[PDB]
Ligand binder design. Sequence first.
Ligand SMILES: [Cl-]
Ligand SMILES: [Cl-]
Length: 143
Amino acid sequence: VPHTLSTLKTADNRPASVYLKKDKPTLIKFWASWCPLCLSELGQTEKWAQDAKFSSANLITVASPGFLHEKKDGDFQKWYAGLNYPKLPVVTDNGGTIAQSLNISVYPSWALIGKDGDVQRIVKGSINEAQALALIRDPNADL
Ligand SMILES: [Cl-]
Ligand SMILES: [Cl-]
């Protein structure tokens, strides 16, 4: 995942690596434009990404154009450009390479990648602040 991720860019054409520090675990939120749950959480997730509470980990989100009912590549970025979450990292994975690799099937879903690149936990559905903090405290913890 860490490699495929480093080869991707954000919805606004910046290297995903810009949001990934080498010695930190990575918390990834998978979502899609058609999901009301996901749309209603964009502001919250942006807040989390900038919150000191999660400073010990990288926090990004992944949208997958042309995968799981998401808008095709190009169309997605144009749609998302209409929203405003400047501090929310939105990596676009055309075809959902990472999602398939992790067998993501519902949105939202969260994955915690160890600092070394190994997938440590995959959580289906939305998580709240308490569950997110638990996930960072211990990948195997009961959120
Ligand atoms: Cl729950
Ligand atoms: Cl909540």
